[PDB]
């Protein structure tokens, strides 16, 4: 995965095919000639690349079009459609980024989210971005839910989630670029010890 083919991979998307979800929102394109579908898929993969290359700031529609080269930056409505689709479904402009277009002071719709775990928190940020009035109700005296970190001094111990299970196609990859996440690899060296206490010989393990 490299270039635009990799941007699709990192977004868990096939780089050379339209998805069911994309067909639903762009039925005009997928039912039509294959040439057009390639134009769509390039804009999609390209826009994802732009966001993924710098996820610390908002990727606007304008900034997307200027970063595009002809003939693709010519059909501006298609680009706008693709951008808003990705924006709305949370493939770009998700997580914690510095906003360019500031939020409208006037909001639309009121939503109550029950729980401020990661799923609740992620939805809230998105809905807030879309201009909705969001309020979260959390039973605990803290956020995170089943992400529960023990802290005393500078000691740290996760009683909840602890492992990131790969960064290839993982939205946590983006989050880690946005946050003070100090990731560390796991040496898969794992010696066993029988009940008696003596190590298990290599060949047996």
């Amino acid at each position: 995965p490299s270039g635009v083919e990799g941007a699709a991979f990192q977004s868990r998307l096939p780089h050379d095919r339209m998805t069911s979800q994309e067909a639903a929102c762009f039925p005009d394109i997928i039912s039509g000639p294959q040439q057009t579908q390639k134009v769509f898929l390039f804009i999609r993969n390209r826009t994802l690349q732009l966001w993924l290359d710098n996820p610390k700031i908002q990727l606007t529609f304008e900034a997307t079009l200027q970063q595009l080269e002809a003939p693709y930056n010519s059909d501006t409505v298609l680009v706008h459609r693709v951008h808003s689709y990705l924006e709305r479904h949370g493939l770009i402009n998700f997580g914690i980024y510095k906003r360019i277009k500031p939020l409208p002071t006037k909001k639309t719709g009121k939503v109550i989210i029950i729980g401020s775990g990661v799923s609740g928190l992620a939805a809230a940020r998105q809905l807030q971005s879309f201009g909705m009035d969001v309020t979260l109700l959390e039973a605990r005296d803290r956020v995170g839910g089943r992400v529960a970190t023990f802290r005393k001094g500078n000691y740290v111990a996760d009683l909840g989630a602890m492992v990131v299970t790969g960064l290839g196609g993982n939205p946590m990859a983006v989050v880690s670029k946005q946050v003070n996440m100090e990731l560390a690899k796991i040496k898969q060296k794992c010696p066993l010890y029988e009940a008696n206490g003596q190590a298990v010989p290599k060949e047996k393990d």
Partner: protein, 51 residues
């Protein structure tokens, strides 16, 4: 109201247990959140990008 039309939903579900391909994970919870945020906005703010 008896005999009225009821097109829109009201109760949405997200979280680790709601995502088929990435259950029991943080990234799966994360993605479920982004999914419903988009569905709620689609349904209440309207999806202009589908026209």
């Amino acid at each position: 109201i008896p005999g009225a039309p009821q097109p829109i939903p009201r109760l949405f579900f997200a979280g680790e247990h709601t995502i088929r391909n990435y259950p029991a994970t943080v990234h799966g919870a994360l993605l479920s959140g982004l999914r419903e945020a988009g569905r709620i906005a689609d349904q209440f703010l309207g999806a202009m990008y589908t026209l």
